[PDB]
Paper text:
DNA interstrand crosslinks (ICLs) are toxic lesions that block DNA replication and transcription, and are detected and repaired by the Fanconi anaemia pathway. The FANCD2–FANCI (D2–I) complex is key to Fanconi anaemia DNA repair as it binds dsDNA and is required for recruitment of nucleases that excise crosslinks. Here, using single-molecule imaging, we show that D2–I is a sliding clamp that binds to and diffuses on double-stranded DNA. Notably, sliding D2–I stalls on encountering single-stranded–double-stranded (ss–ds) DNA junctions, structures that are generated when replication forks stall at DNA lesions.
To visualize the interaction with an ss–dsDNA junction, we used a DNA with a 29 bp ds region flanked by 30 nt and 40 nt ssDNA overhangs (ss–dsDNA). We determined a cryo-EM reconstruction of D2–I bound to this DNA at 3.6 Å resolution. The complex of D2–I with ss–dsDNA was also in a closed configuration, clamped on DNA. However, in contrast to the structure with fully dsDNA, the ds region of the ss–dsDNA is very well defined, with clearly visible major and minor grooves. This suggests that the ss–dsDNA junction occupies a preferred binding position on D2–I with a specific base register. We propose that this represents a stalled D2–I complex. Like the dsDNA, the ds region of the ss–dsDNA first makes direct contact with the basic C-arch of FANCI. There are several contacts within this region, but one loop in FANCI (residues 793–798) seems to play a principal role in stabilizing the position of the DNA duplex by approaching the minor groove. The well-defined density for the dsDNA region then extends straight into the base of the clamp and ends by contacting a lysine- and arginine-rich (KR) helix in the N-terminal domain of FANCD2 (residues 397–412). Overall, our structure of stalled D2–I shows that FANCI binds to dsDNA through its C-arch, but the FANCD2 KR helix specifically recognizes the ss–dsDNA junction by means of direct interactions with the DNA.
Numbering used by the authors:
A (entry chain A): 247 to 312, 349 to 394, 399 to 492
B (entry chain B): 957 to 1106, 1121 to 1167, 1169 to 1179, 1187 to 1226, 1241 to 1298
C (entry chain B): 384 to 396, 415 to 553
D (entry chain A): 1231 to 1398
The structure:
DNA sequence: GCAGCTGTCTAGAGACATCGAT
DNA sequence: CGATGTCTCTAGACAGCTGC
């Protein structure tokens, strides 16, 4: 309620800083149904240079636990923090081992793009992001499949056809994984994309 | 409306230097550059005004810098939608070379004066950066024309060869200028790297030979490359003199005044290399016009080491 | 045509300004003469304005104003889907809200439901103690008073 | 020979590049340890360039152009940062290394000129980058001299064009 | 007789080359 | 990818070269 009131109230820098470090200190300690309001506040109410590491603190807070779609909307409400998220995962994947939350939020920012795909290509050439984690993600968190978002992720294979063909195989694997869950209309759209692939282009994607 | 503003300028400009009130001159010059925008193309008043600012440029000798810069922009913002500005740029380059010294400081340029605005002071980066600014613009659209060139094709090649022939006469008379140190030297070296990238037109015509194109290379070989290398033999000593005035690290001022020189060398050879391809393919030897490439070495004077 | 325009506003962000002009022109033409797709065009432009504040987005409001002044009944035909847009008081209500209200003025006047939604959203916005929220509230107040006319 | 020449230049350039990069006088007793290496390296380079003079075969020139350019670029990128600081510690030996380098790389301009004279399409393709790199070396030497306040001790002069082991 | 006038030095601000990797 | 330093400059100042 204090953070909700401060959301309602105006902002002053000196107090905002100390209360926001206090918030970051007290985000993960509470139950998963309680911190989302805090995350929404720090998203649509707070914007600063230090957010580039505050969001990394949030990532560490949410690393363990990973219906709970309010966080997605909170990230939708503002876009500058999403660019900060891209900047943070530019180095978060450089040290941390590509946690599932990283690829989830990467899909979210790519949905809400050019910088995301540039980062994806760079880490394709860098560390290839072991895809068992995203297999588990599509196994458990398939409620946000909505093929229009991963469609660009798949068609990135075309730009990844110049070299490193293994990542094309990983993209094929993850489209195989995403097909066998639900969303029969999305399944037929995936089959339409696949027949497009066998029709246009050379024999490789065929 | 401009005529009453014209009367104010001619009276104000003709006034003595003690009554120049430069703030007035800048605004009135800019006020014409804004009002002259909406003069229609199909009017005679376009011409007598255009010939008036030319004749006011030929006669008046103004020593202010922003005044000269502002007035020239008007002339080049209007002689850009009526004709080819390269005729004006050549004349400006004719004056700059005449006004300043010579690249070889051995042969004396005739003391001509195509414009009275350019004096011993105004030939500074004040004008020499505007001329190279306009020259860059002309080269920029020529790239588009070369892009378009790559029954209407014959007409396109007529203008490009004619303009580049005039444009080469601009740089030939401008690279021979004894430019002062600073950014004006740096602009010329980079702009010379632009005009050579002459390569794309040669590269396109590999698909084909015409006599007009051969004359251009004849012009290019006899007007740009031998003169261009003379500039490099001069920029090495003007920067040595300019480098003595340090605290009177230095690494910034040694890897910044010399960086254009390697790039200019590369542009010359790349243009030179694509002539090899055309000379063999087009069964015509077009290299008797030009001369051999010249390089430079050094020897650290250990005698004067300390 | 409508897909081309949608991705035109997408690809905008001067040739970019010319692209905006061309996209606004084609969208207005395809809205004016095509009857059964004008609702789709309105839905597309309503879905495209949101989450767009970093780039100059005045094109959205201006072409929306043009298409509603050419055809104001489209929003009611779309069952007045502008009510959801009232949340824009937190993204960038410096000028977008003013222009949006300017555009939707006749449809707020004719339609009582959208007027009631506007008055309630502004009433809950005014006492929000945020500087941005209060700015949005006072901006909306600047327009709502003249939305209704009784002087003569 | 050309196979030997190709592999020898490639290995020499790779070994030269493998040397650790520039350092801002981080350690004593290393700025002279890491100079005899480049002394013997430029010795080997000069030897190979001399071996060019006896075999003017076209593949030999094609190998030499490219790999001399690559070795010069690697030298400029790596050894010269060491030279900046090492000039104060050691004065004549670095100068001798520079004399050897000028002795070797001076022939590469002659090879470029010979390639241009005969209009060899497949061999002139490497001339511009090598010439640019040689000019870059010429001026990076000025930069190094500036690192130790030696600006009247430099003199960039015109190089007389020569044929392969010949003249003009 | 130390009162007058005469100018390079310094801070303003705006445009460019490479500035240094995203 | 583009924040940054470098540079033509226009003026102002108080301080050296006129003076006094």
């Amino acid at each position: 309620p204090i953070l909700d009131a401060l959301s309602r109230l105006d902002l002053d820098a000196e107090l905002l800083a100390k209360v926001r470090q206090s918030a970051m200190t007290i985000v993960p300690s509470v139950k998963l149904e309680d911190l989302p309001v805090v995350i929404k506040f720090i998203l649509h109410n707070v914007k600063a240079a230090d957010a580039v590491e505050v969001i990394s603190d949030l990532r560490k807070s949410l690393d363990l636990s990973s219906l709970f779609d309010v966080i997605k909307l909170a990230v939708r409400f503002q876009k500058d923090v999403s660019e900060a998220w891209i900047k943070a995962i530019e180095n978060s994947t450089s040290v941390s081992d590509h946690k599932v939350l990283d690829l989830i939020v990467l899909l979210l920012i790519h949905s809400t793009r050019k910088q995301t795909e540039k980062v994806l290509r760079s880490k394709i050439r860098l560390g290839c992001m072991p895809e068992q984690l995203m297999q588990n993600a599509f196994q458990n968190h398939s409620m946000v499949i909505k093929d229009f978002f991963p469609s660009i992720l798949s068609l990135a294979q075309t730009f990844l056809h110049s070299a490193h063909p293994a990542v094309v195989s990983f993209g094929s694997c993850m489209y195989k994984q995403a097909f066998a869950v639900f969303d029969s209309y999305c399944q037929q759209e995936v089959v339409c994309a696949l027949v497009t692939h066998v029709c246009s282009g050379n024999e490789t994607e065929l | 409306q401009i005529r009453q503003f014209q009367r104010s300028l001619v009276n104000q400009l003709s006034s003595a230097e003690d009554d120049f009130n430069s703030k007035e001159t800048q605004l009135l010059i800019t006020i014409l550059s804004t009002l002259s925008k909406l003069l229609d193309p199909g009017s005679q008043q376009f011409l007598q005004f255009l010939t008036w600012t030319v004749k006011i440029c030929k006669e008046n000798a103004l020593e202010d810098l922003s005044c000269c810069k502002g007035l020239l922009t008007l002339l080049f913002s209007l002689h850009v939608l009526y004709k080819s500005p390269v005729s004006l740029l050549r004349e400006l380059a004719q004056d700059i070379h005449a006004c300043l010294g010579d690249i070889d400081q051995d042969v004396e340029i005739e003391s001509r004066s195509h414009f009275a605005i350019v004096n011993v002071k105004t030939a500074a980066p004040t004008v020499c950066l505007l001329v190279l600014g306009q020259a860059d613009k002309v080269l920029e659209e020529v790239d588009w024309l070369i892009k378009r060139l790559t029954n209407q094709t014959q007409a396109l090649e007529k203008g490009v060869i004619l303009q580049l022939g005039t444009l080469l006469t601009v740089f030939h008379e401008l690279v021979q200028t004894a430019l002062p140190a600073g950014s004006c030297v740096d602009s010329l070296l980079r702009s010379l790297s632009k005009t050579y990238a002459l390569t794309s037109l040669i590269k396109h015509y590999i698909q084909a030979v015409p006599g007009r194109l051969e004359k251009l290379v004849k012009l290019s070989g006899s007007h740009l490359t031998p003169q261009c290398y003379s500039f490099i033999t001069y920029v090495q000593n003007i920067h040595s003199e300019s480098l003595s005035f340090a605290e009177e690290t230095v690494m910034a001022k040694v890897l910044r005044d010399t960086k254009p020189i390697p790039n200019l060398i590369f542009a010359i050879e790349q243009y030179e290399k694509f002539l090899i391809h055309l000379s063999k393919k087009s069964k015509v030897n077009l290299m008797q016009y030009m001369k051999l490439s010249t390089s430079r070495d050094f020897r650290i004077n250990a005698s004067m080491l300390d | 045509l409508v897909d081309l325009g949608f991705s035109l506003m997408e690809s905008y962000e001067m040739p970019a300004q010319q692209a905006c002009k061309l996209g606004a022109s084609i969208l207005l033409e395809t809205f004016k003469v095509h009857e059964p797709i004008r609702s789709d065009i309105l839905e597309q432009v309503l879905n495209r304005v949101l989450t767009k504040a970093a780039s100059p987005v005045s094109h959205f409001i201006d072409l929306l104003s043009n298409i509603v002044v050419s055809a104001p009944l489209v929003l009611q035909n779309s069952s007045s889907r502008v009510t959801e847009t009232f949340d824009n008081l937190s993204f960038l209500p410096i000028d977008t809200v003013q222009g949006l209200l300017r555009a939707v003025q006749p449809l707020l006047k004719v339609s009582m439901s959208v007027r009631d939604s506007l008055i309630l959203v502004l009433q809950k916005a005014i006492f929000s103690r945020q500087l941005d929220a209060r700015k949005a509230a006072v901006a909306g107040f600047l327009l709502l008073l003249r939305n209704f006319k009784i002087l003569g | 020979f050309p196979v030997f020449f190709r592999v020898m230049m490639a290995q020499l350039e790779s070994s030269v590049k493998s040397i650790p990069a520039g350092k801002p006088s981080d350690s004593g007793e290393v700025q002279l340890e890491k100079l005899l290496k480049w002394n013997i390296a430029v010795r080997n380079f000069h030897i190979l360039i001399n071996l060019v003079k006896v075999f003017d075969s076209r593949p030999v020139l094609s190998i030499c152009l490219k790999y001399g350019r690559l070795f010069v670029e690697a030298f400029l990128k790596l050894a010269m940062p060491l030279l900046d600081h090492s000039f104060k510690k050691h004065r004549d030996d670095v100068q001798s290394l520079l004399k050897t380098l000028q002795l070797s790389t001076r022939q590469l301009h002659h090879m470029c000129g010979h390639s241009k004279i005969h209009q060899d399409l497949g061999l002139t393709n490497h001339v511009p980058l090598l010439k640019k790199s040689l000019e870059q070396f010429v001026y990076r030497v000025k930069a190094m001299l500036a690192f130790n306040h030696c600006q009247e001790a430099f003199w960039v002069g015109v190089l007389k064009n020569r044929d392969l082991q010949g003249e003009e």
